Design a protein around this motif. Structure first.
Motif, PDB file in Angstrom:
ATOM      1  N   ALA D 123       0.817  -1.206   0.000  1.00 41.25           N
ATOM      2  CA  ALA D 123       0.000   0.000   0.000  1.00 41.25           C
ATOM      3  C   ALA D 123       0.858   1.266   0.000  1.00 41.25           C
ATOM      4  CB  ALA D 123      -0.924  -0.010   1.214  1.00 41.25           C
ATOM      5  N   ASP D 124       2.040   1.177   0.601  1.00 36.04           N
ATOM      6  CA  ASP D 124       2.963   2.304   0.673  1.00 36.04           C
ATOM      7  C   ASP D 124       3.794   2.435  -0.596  1.00 36.04           C
ATOM      8  OD1 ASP D 124       3.847   2.168   4.241  1.00 36.04           O
ATOM      9  OD2 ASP D 124       2.143   3.047   3.176  1.00 36.04           O
ATOM     10  N   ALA D 125       3.771   1.399  -1.428  1.00 35.90           N
ATOM     11  CA  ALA D 125       4.553   1.384  -2.657  1.00 35.90           C
ATOM     12  C   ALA D 125       3.844   1.935  -3.891  1.00 35.90           C
ATOM     13  CB  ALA D 125       5.038  -0.036  -2.934  1.00 35.90           C
ATOM     14  N   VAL D 126       2.525   2.075  -3.823  1.00 38.22           N
ATOM     15  CA  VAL D 126       1.767   2.583  -4.961  1.00 38.22           C
ATOM     16  C   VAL D 126       0.780   3.672  -4.558  1.00 38.22           C
ATOM     17  CG1 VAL D 126       1.950   0.392  -6.181  1.00 38.22           C
ATOM     18  CG2 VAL D 126      -0.021   0.816  -4.707  1.00 38.22           C
ATOM     19  N   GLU D 127       0.251   4.378  -5.551  1.00 42.38           N
ATOM     20  CA  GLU D 127      -0.718   5.433  -5.295  1.00 42.38           C
ATOM     21  C   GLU D 127      -2.131   4.952  -5.622  1.00 42.38           C
ATOM     22  OE1 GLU D 127       0.382   9.536  -6.528  1.00 42.38           O
ATOM     23  OE2 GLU D 127       2.300   8.661  -7.140  1.00 42.38           O
ATOM     24  N   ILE D 128      -2.231   3.829  -6.328  1.00 43.82           N
ATOM     25  CA  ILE D 128      -3.533   3.277  -6.681  1.00 43.82           C
ATOM     26  C   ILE D 128      -4.093   2.465  -5.511  1.00 43.82           C
ATOM     27  CG2 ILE D 128      -3.164   3.231  -9.173  1.00 43.82           C
ATOM     28  CD1 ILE D 128      -2.258   0.359  -8.940  1.00 43.82           C
ATOM     29  N   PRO D 129      -5.422   2.276  -5.472  1.00 46.39           N
ATOM     30  CA  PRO D 129      -6.114   1.526  -4.416  1.00 46.39           C
ATOM     31  C   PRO D 129      -5.659   0.076  -4.264  1.00 46.39           C
ATOM     32  CG  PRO D 129      -7.647   2.874  -5.613  1.00 46.39           C
ATOM     33  CD  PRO D 129      -6.395   2.808  -6.441  1.00 46.39           C
ATOM     34  N   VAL D 130      -5.663  -0.405  -3.024  1.00 42.17           N
ATOM     35  CA  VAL D 130      -5.274  -1.777  -2.721  1.00 42.17           C
ATOM     36  C   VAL D 130      -6.462  -2.594  -2.216  1.00 42.17           C
ATOM     37  CG1 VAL D 130      -3.895  -3.271  -1.228  1.00 42.17           C
ATOM     38  CG2 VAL D 130      -2.891  -1.171  -2.170  1.00 42.17           C
ATOM     39  N   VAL D 131      -6.625  -3.787  -2.779  1.00 44.99           N
ATOM     40  CA  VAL D 131      -7.694  -4.695  -2.388  1.00 44.99           C
ATOM     41  C   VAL D 131      -7.034  -5.848  -1.629  1.00 44.99           C
ATOM     42  CG1 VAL D 131      -9.523  -6.227  -3.179  1.00 44.99           C
ATOM     43  CG2 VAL D 131      -9.013  -4.140  -4.461  1.00 44.99           C
ATOM     44  N   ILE D 132      -7.386  -6.006  -0.356  1.00 43.77           N
ATOM     45  CA  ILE D 132      -6.822  -7.074   0.470  1.00 43.77           C
ATOM     46  C   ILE D 132      -7.453  -8.416   0.132  1.00 43.77           C
ATOM     47  CG2 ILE D 132      -6.515  -7.979   2.801  1.00 43.77           C
ATOM     48  CD1 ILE D 132      -4.914  -5.420   2.056  1.00 43.77           C
ATOM     49  N   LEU D 143      -5.674 -13.191   7.728  1.00 39.04           N
ATOM     50  CA  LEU D 143      -5.994 -12.055   8.584  1.00 39.04           C
ATOM     51  C   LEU D 143      -7.186 -12.181   9.523  1.00 39.04           C
ATOM     52  CD1 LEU D 143      -5.992 -11.505   5.342  1.00 39.04           C
ATOM     53  CD2 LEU D 143      -5.354  -9.208   6.012  1.00 39.04           C
ATOM     54  N   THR D 144      -6.978 -11.771  10.769  1.00 35.86           N
ATOM     55  CA  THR D 144      -8.036 -11.773  11.774  1.00 35.86           C
ATOM     56  C   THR D 144      -8.816 -10.475  11.537  1.00 35.86           C
ATOM     57  OG1 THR D 144      -6.739 -10.480  13.353  1.00 35.86           O
ATOM     58  CG2 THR D 144      -6.502 -12.886  13.451  1.00 35.86           C
ATOM     59  N   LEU D 145      -9.970 -10.333  12.181  1.00 40.43           N
ATOM     60  CA  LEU D 145     -10.762  -9.118  12.014  1.00 40.43           C
ATOM     61  C   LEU D 145      -9.999  -7.910  12.534  1.00 40.43           C
ATOM     62  CD1 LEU D 145     -14.331 -10.352  12.960  1.00 40.43           C
ATOM     63  CD2 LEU D 145     -13.454  -9.673  10.706  1.00 40.43           C
ATOM     64  N   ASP D 146      -9.250  -8.103  13.619  1.00 41.82           N
ATOM     65  CA  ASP D 146      -8.468  -7.015  14.194  1.00 41.82           C
ATOM     66  C   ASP D 146      -7.448  -6.511  13.181  1.00 41.82           C
ATOM     67  OD1 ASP D 146      -9.832  -7.117  16.585  1.00 41.82           O
ATOM     68  OD2 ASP D 146      -8.243  -8.153  17.682  1.00 41.82           O
ATOM     69  N   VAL D 147      -6.696  -7.429  12.586  1.00 38.45           N
ATOM     70  CA  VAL D 147      -5.698  -7.049  11.588  1.00 38.45           C
ATOM     71  C   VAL D 147      -6.376  -6.343  10.410  1.00 38.45           C
ATOM     72  CG1 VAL D 147      -4.078  -7.912   9.867  1.00 38.45           C
ATOM     73  CG2 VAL D 147      -4.024  -8.829  12.195  1.00 38.45           C
ATOM     74  N   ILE D 148      -7.499  -6.886   9.959  1.00 34.92           N
ATOM     75  CA  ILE D 148      -8.229  -6.288   8.848  1.00 34.92           C
ATOM     76  C   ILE D 148      -8.640  -4.856   9.198  1.00 34.92           C
ATOM     77  CG2 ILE D 148     -10.352  -6.352   7.504  1.00 34.92           C
ATOM     78  CD1 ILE D 148     -10.243  -9.398   7.604  1.00 34.92           C
ATOM     79  N   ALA D 149      -9.167  -4.671  10.406  1.00 37.50           N
ATOM     80  CA  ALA D 149      -9.597  -3.347  10.846  1.00 37.50           C
ATOM     81  C   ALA D 149      -8.408  -2.393  10.840  1.00 37.50           C
ATOM     82  CB  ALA D 149     -10.202  -3.425  12.254  1.00 37.50           C
ATOM     83  N   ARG D 150      -7.267  -2.857  11.341  1.00 34.38           N
ATOM     84  CA  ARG D 150      -6.075  -2.014  11.363  1.00 34.38           C
ATOM     85  C   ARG D 150      -5.643  -1.624   9.949  1.00 34.38           C
ATOM     86  NH1 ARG D 150      -5.039  -4.936  15.678  1.00 34.38           N
ATOM     87  NH2 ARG D 150      -3.615  -6.558  14.902  1.00 34.38           N
ATOM     88  N   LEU D 151      -5.637  -2.589   9.036  1.00 31.71           N
ATOM     89  CA  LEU D 151      -5.239  -2.312   7.657  1.00 31.71           C
ATOM     90  C   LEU D 151      -6.193  -1.332   6.983  1.00 31.71           C
ATOM     91  CD1 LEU D 151      -4.014  -5.823   6.549  1.00 31.71           C
ATOM     92  CD2 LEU D 151      -2.623  -3.725   6.724  1.00 31.71           C
ATOM     93  N   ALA D 152      -7.477  -1.426   7.309  1.00 35.98           N
ATOM     94  CA  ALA D 152      -8.468  -0.519   6.732  1.00 35.98           C
ATOM     95  C   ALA D 152      -8.129   0.941   7.047  1.00 35.98           C
ATOM     96  CB  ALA D 152      -9.867  -0.852   7.256  1.00 35.98           C
ATOM     97  N   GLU D 153      -7.322   1.174   8.078  1.00 34.14           N
ATOM     98  CA  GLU D 153      -6.953   2.546   8.431  1.00 34.14           C
ATOM     99  C   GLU D 153      -6.000   3.161   7.413  1.00 34.14           C
ATOM    100  OE1 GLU D 153      -5.739   3.203  12.580  1.00 34.14           O
ATOM    101  OE2 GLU D 153      -6.840   1.376  13.122  1.00 34.14           O
ATOM    102  N   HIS D 154      -5.369   2.326   6.598  1.00 33.68           N
ATOM    103  CA  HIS D 154      -4.437   2.828   5.599  1.00 33.68           C
ATOM    104  C   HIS D 154      -5.197   3.558   4.495  1.00 33.68           C
ATOM    105  CE1 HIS D 154      -1.485   3.028   2.411  1.00 33.68           C
ATOM    106  NE2 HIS D 154      -0.552   2.691   3.284  1.00 33.68           N
ATOM    107  N   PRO D 155      -4.819   4.813   4.216  1.00 33.09           N
ATOM    108  CA  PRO D 155      -5.502   5.596   3.179  1.00 33.09           C
ATOM    109  C   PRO D 155      -5.750   4.923   1.828  1.00 33.09           C
ATOM    110  CG  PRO D 155      -3.265   6.383   3.507  1.00 33.09           C
ATOM    111  CD  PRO D 155      -3.601   5.498   4.686  1.00 33.09           C
ATOM    112  N   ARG D 156      -4.889   3.992   1.424  1.00 39.21           N
ATOM    113  CA  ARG D 156      -5.071   3.341   0.128  1.00 39.21           C
ATOM    114  C   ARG D 156      -5.593   1.895   0.161  1.00 39.21           C
ATOM    115  NH1 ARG D 156      -1.248   6.888   0.047  1.00 39.21           N
ATOM    116  NH2 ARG D 156       0.500   5.510   0.612  1.00 39.21           N
ATOM    117  N   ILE D 157      -5.782   1.342   1.353  1.00 37.10           N
ATOM    118  CA  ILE D 157      -6.341  -0.005   1.455  1.00 37.10           C
ATOM    119  C   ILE D 157      -7.825   0.277   1.629  1.00 37.10           C
ATOM    120  CG2 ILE D 157      -6.531  -2.071   2.874  1.00 37.10           C
ATOM    121  CD1 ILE D 157      -3.544  -1.667   3.582  1.00 37.10           C
ATOM    122  N   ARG D 158      -8.574   0.116   0.544  1.00 35.62           N
ATOM    123  CA  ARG D 158      -9.990   0.451   0.552  1.00 35.62           C
ATOM    124  C   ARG D 158     -10.976  -0.665   0.247  1.00 35.62           C
ATOM    125  NH1 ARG D 158      -9.048   6.112  -2.946  1.00 35.62           N
ATOM    126  NH2 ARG D 158      -7.344   6.879  -1.619  1.00 35.62           N
TER     127      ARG D 158
END
Lengths: 290, 291, 288, 288
Positions: D123-132, D143-158
């Motif tokens: 997510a930090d390597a590109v400017e385009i959206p990331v799909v987990i 990924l656990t729900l906690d990890v998923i929730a944390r990743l969702a905080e990233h501006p490009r992981i949408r």
């Protein structure tokens, strides 16, 4: 026909393992008064795996007596052998059960022919309808779509309850068996999605602590009022997510206790929820309390 | 005095109605003792404990004890999902005359270590005879870690552990950790000679029922450190294990014993007995190891 | 014929992923002087799953150059496809490998015939011996005894290395294949037990940090001095239990670093052992 | 925003592993024309696991050039290491991809902190959206729900795409992240149910052979015409059932071949469907 919400009743016992018929009675009466469409003693939430011959009979007898024919009582019959399952089924039918929740427990691996003979044996043992229990994610020996199809050919095998998280599996069963086998789900499946694809209801432990809300969700789905159903489904799903970390029997027993029911603790070595874990059950309950 | 050697996992002889055949069990146990086995273990996995009710289980243990006549120790398998039931079984078999208890934990809902530990201590505290801890993390839903095993060994009555998994390396970790406090027994999933090499004291297995003299001979060769001879024999007995491996062990041993003249009956339905074609395959291995 | 102790070499790299051929060379040289009987780059401990084509070639090349023909170098060939595996095998053979450790990685499930075709393809692509890798407890697609027996018929498939904990399986293989397929074990099997039942040696990560002791253990087993072998085996087995809950590559790299080898850290996302976790490495090493 | 039907494109190659750009182009073109809302190359069905770096680039390039920006192209990025995943992501973005489908492959177990670092690096390597990408039922490290929730905080992981059969977890995700993580499902989930609970669409292989129907199903759900949607869902589900026993990449490739696309066979060791198995594919395609 069986439909709607069947709460998986916890099995109330004291320290010595004696079944509390009186506590079970008021719980069953209150659930029925809340509008549940059936009752299911000796399901997983009922700790069938921890109760002996006498305890199971006592649980079933108490449930039947408290229900007074108001709603169908489907009794769980779990065993590793044909003889034992047949004995249980015949006994529960004799006590007054309206249906049998057939559960196959396996030790040594079984081929499809053997698996089929077990369920067929239980059905041939009674005159009341049988509900096949299935969960490929937990059970050592389970059912393939083909075995299920062949079983549905038995006159008295007319329902199946899947407790896995594979909802797609349910749609395959319905596409294959249609009305010859009506589908029930468990808390691992999203109730609203199960009803959307053709299921007739669900048997679940949480229904014990949120009977009216569960019935309401069922009614909303039946009426096709999906937006309202989903609002409610999200809230009730949050309840499951909170429980999805604890021993479910210990969880519901803790919740029922918080609601005034002296259901006691789960059978050792299972542990009762700690004061801290209980506080968490308390919060989720208070959030959906009406 | 301590448990050691070959302990056959006795099959549970029953008729189509499910009634234990005490007489057949009697002749089998008597023959195994004359064959030199060092102990008897009824109600093990091969004994179909998971398919027998509390009444049938008592009938099995009773029949075995009576037959043994204290000639060799009888270790009764106690399997349950609850402390109350397990405690009741253990006290019952101890009363009937058992010399030890093979504690088997069956689980439904997952258990944390403290709970798993409480189960075994409850059984050990309920009797005065030795307890053998059963373990097989490859099949059991709730098993034991080395730390739990080490804590359990501190109980004066828990003196043995029997592992039915194929993980022999784990047996060495247990020995390094507990030393003499916990004497190790293996099952047929482990190579007997390898277990004896690393410090085990013997094994409890179903095949011992159909090849008692050869099993005893293997044990003695290993104990005497005659490894060349022990392995010649081991390679032969392993071929037997390899042949049974594709069958329900209980069904296999029952069919095997029948071929040897013991009317032990068939496994408890829904289990299937070996088919005629499967029985020929078993008659084949027996013929090859018959002495 | 391959026998004895084959260390599963770690793959030393810098933070940029560049292989440290210099450090790898000193490590291999030191291990050879310690008496190891062979070297195996690109095994699980060598983090093959985290290295690209170029990195893999660099590792193998570095190992061969340092070995100087003193002991056989068996290169790990891991892939999900025939074409890629054949390409690796032909490349490592060309670079001078003495053998190929064939590893089948699978994504979609494979029937026995397809599994068999993967190994036969590797064997048909080179003239050097092939060691079949197997670990039913971890691999998505593995080998049944029937498949192993058929593969043993290929003139160049002469060995098999099993990394599972199922030592009984090894004896079944030996009873079925005899000398047509010589058996190697991994750290999951007790070395002395493997030698007792007919194995010829073992390929493992722990050998990297305790080469001399591992070699001594092998020699005692070969000389049938079981009493002394077991005394040593009991000591060396502590390494396995000490690393049980950790990334094995992380453990061996930490251990080697403690011994003076600038091997670097595991390839991210893998994490190097924390200071606290490393205490178990310092401990078991002091103990050995 | 990504939504609707994203066909998991198969990767057409010849017997020698060369990607057939012309074929891929004709397939993408007809898909877009069929109404699909997006294209996803290098997904499971695209045999990313059997394709090398060069082949993967060819697939991605061939898909982007064909799309001509008509629909967004989300390129699958699968790797065991951060370095390789970052390189891939940067390359695909550079080629013109509109999104990245981050897939974490694991060998040694990884703690949550490490799993999270993998996705964040991409997510930090590109400017385009990331799909987990997630599938606890197959992946070694998920990924656990906690990890998923944390990743969702990233501006490009949408977005997040779940390929397991556990639809219940999709709702748990929606309740926890909401708008922050729009959900996509796969063949293992019933499309109608996913849309009912709040999903925005699905990425699947079957959409390759039944695009118009898949798109129709989507529109029906979005229009809340549940009766019609379910009648259509029951039919399209017969497809999911029919392939249940086969390699999905092999089914889709066989199915496309029957429809006139010279996409070729799956990469060996995978086997193409036999005749008896293709007849089966013929019937399901006829049923609808």
């Amino acid at each position: 026909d069986f439909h709607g919400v069947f709460p998986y009743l916890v099995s109330p016992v004291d320290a010595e393992g004696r079944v509390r018929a009186d506590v079970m009675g008021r719980l069953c009466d209150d659930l029925i008064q809340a509008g549940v469409h059936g009752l299911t003693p000796l399901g997983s939430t009922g700790e069938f795996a921890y109760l002996g011959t006498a305890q199971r009979e006592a649980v079933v007898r108490a449930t039947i007596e408290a229900a007074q024919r108001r709603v169908p009582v489907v009794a769980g019959v779990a065993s590793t052998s044909v003889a034992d399952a047949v004995a249980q089924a015949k006994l529960y039918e004799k006590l007054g059960a309206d249906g049998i929740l057939a559960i196959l427990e396996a030790y040594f691996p079984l081929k499809d022919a053997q698996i089929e003979s077990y369920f067929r044996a239980i059905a041939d043992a009674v005159e009341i309808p049988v509900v096949i229990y299935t969960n490929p994610q937990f059970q050592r020996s389970d059912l393939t779509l083909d075995v299920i199809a062949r079983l549905a050919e038995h006159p008295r095998i007319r329902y199946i309850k899947d407790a896995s998280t594979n909802t797609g599996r349910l749609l395959s069963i319905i596409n294959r068996c249609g009305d010859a086998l009506q589908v029930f789900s468990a808390s691992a499946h999203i109730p609203a999605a199960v009803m959307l694809i053709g299921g007739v209801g669900w048997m679940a432990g949480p229904a014990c602590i949120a009977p009216r809300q569960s019935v309401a969700l069922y009614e909303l789905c039946k009426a096709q009022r999906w937006d309202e159903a989903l609002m409610l489904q999200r809230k009730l799903w949050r309840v499951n997510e909170a429980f999805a970390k604890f021993n479910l029997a210990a969880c519901i027993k803790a919740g029922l206790a918080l609601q005034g029911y002296d259901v006691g603790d789960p059978i050792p070595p299972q542990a009762a929820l700690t004061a801290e874990e209980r506080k968490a059950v308390e919060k989720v309950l208070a959030e959906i309390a009406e």
